[PDB]
Symmetry: none
Subunit: 71 residues, 4 copies
């Protein structure tokens, strides 16, 4: 796995573990579930790019300890 | 203290601090409390071994930044 | 940003990111929000000192990976 | 004080002065009062984030001549 941080605009940083070729939708759904949030209300970006349902960390060239931003 | 990660099957990683000779039941109860989960519904393992109420990190030979798995 | 840990007496460690000259009240309010807790019920300390509304990490001489204690 | 602009979707830009640790609710109420508008009908955002009653310009990392958006 690689470790990723999910950072909210409030400064919250939540941690996930994901394999490099696993879709990030696994993480996004988990984050929504754990944070009591809805995919209706939030969106995720990496390095300014929206993350789509089938994007994987490897396709987005993410590395251990990288941060995904939530808006 | 040593720092331990508690990893869910959804990829969530939550962090705890615990002293080496303190029972891990301290951590398990805290995790359930913070995650809104019940000891009825989940169980914790380290390196494939179930964690019992009085097991300590030292008895289970845990080290800083080790991961406990939740199922 | 610098990364700060917020540690509860139950051993929970939650992570925040904050800029050095931004008031820590940003973090305290976020922690309360994310943890479902109230500023009525809890207080935050760093190195034994209460944290006030306008105190910044730089004024309190905090560094990356320092811990704020909640009581 | 810092100077802030409040921009409507019609392109109107109205100016306020506020101290960095004063809640922005001071400004929001003033804007509603001066513009003949109601907090029922409008909401304020900064950099895509909703502004809450006790948020201060310092907590939201606002600077002189920044713009708050009204919707």
């Amino acid at each position: 796995h690689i470790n990723l941080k999910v950072a909210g605009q409030d400064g919250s940083v939540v941690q996930f573990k994901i394999k490099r070729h696993t879709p990030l939708s696994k993480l996004m759904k988990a984050y929504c579930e754990r944070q009591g949030l809805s995919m209706r209300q939030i969106r995720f970006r990496f390095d300014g790019q929206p993350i789509n349902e089938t994007d994987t960390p490897a396709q987005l060239e993410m590395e251990d300890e990288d941060t995904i931003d939530v808006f």
